[PDB]
Design a protein around this nucleic acid. Sequence first.
RNA 1: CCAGGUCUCUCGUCCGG
Length: 461
Amino acid sequence: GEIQWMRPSKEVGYPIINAPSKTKLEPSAFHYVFEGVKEPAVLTKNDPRLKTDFEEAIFSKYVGNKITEVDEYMKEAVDHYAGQLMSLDINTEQMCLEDAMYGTDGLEALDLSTSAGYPYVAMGKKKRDILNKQTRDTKEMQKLLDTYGINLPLVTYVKDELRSKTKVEQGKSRLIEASSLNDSVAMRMAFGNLYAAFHKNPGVITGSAVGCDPDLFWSKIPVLMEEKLFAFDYTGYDASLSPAWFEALKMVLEKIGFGDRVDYIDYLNHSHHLYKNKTYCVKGGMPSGCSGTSIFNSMINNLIIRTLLLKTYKGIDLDHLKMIAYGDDVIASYPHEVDASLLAQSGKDYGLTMTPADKSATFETVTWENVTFLKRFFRADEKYPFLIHPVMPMKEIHESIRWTKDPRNTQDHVRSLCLLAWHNGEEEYNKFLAKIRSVPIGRALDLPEYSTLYRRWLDSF
RNA sequence: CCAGGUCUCUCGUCCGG
Ligand SMILES: [Zn+2]
């Protein structure tokens, strides 16, 4: 990522755009029942909690471009990854405007609850206005595509979401790029059969977890991994992706049959964003509010890792690589042990900031007792050891419960957190129900019992 | 009165076969 210029958008004929300026998070019934260190993220420049300049902070992530050329380790990685995907027999055809708009097997419909973005947003126009799920009417969309085309600017927003104390003071509020309806539709027409293939095949062939259900997948994962685990964190993954990675991606796409629409990837790489009263231009990087980001980022991870293993270990057989990524998040295995500090080493040379997994001070052996994926741990059931619980820690569930975006949701919300928390075990789950019930509104809530949740789990297998 | 992206999973409401 790398800004290439800002400037009042007035002098370039673009609309001013009024971001909402107030959080929607409000303390919960359970704010004082449970402890927690997190709070709403900074939404504006004029925020009392700020120990630093906002805009400087939120635009700090665009760090520059280490490389641009696809060297020969990347090339082999590309070759190896593309060959795996080839075994999925992915339909390489354009998706029709109807499926792209309304969904097919393996691809949901466009979210009607969200913005349609530029320019529809400066026209007071909405997705619901354009799209009809019932009739599956395409006439209106096609006219808007014909009229406004593709490759439109994005609209920058700051995400309203809980954030820790130090990220509040540091103004590390995260940013959002409202992709345009036109571009979502074009991206799904081109890539829809790709996204569908990935959603239908979470596992070690796609090397992606998109489409999985942790409650069930977790029992599948250890059997898919090779003997020895390794993993690490990135710092600013999207921001740190240099053009070379996007070329390598394009190469994978040519290799599995999407040659004709890799130009869509370039378009993603040069993008104009309108934030508030100005307008910038990033070169490199992929906006996160774009279609397929989630899948493309998982794809890049698979290349990034392959690249580093080939560079670091002479004669490593990639055929014994087993990894599953969900964007930057990854869990990886190999029949003999690999040193992620050494992997993090070579990653320095590609713009990649790789730190011990799980905020640890040091790189340490990754074990089935310490590895985490999608924020959850792995723990065999006590009675059926082949069945593995995805264990999210109560700390996180505690953070969530102390807040709400509408108290009308308390029952749905809390009940959802129970489906996460019982994996921590009967003694810890019951404690949870204690506290929730320690206040009156809690005792209004119908909450499942450990045994109900447990039977449901065993049955779901 | 609204206003804030892409996705996945699940749950709930409701409604169908
Ligand atoms: Zn530009």
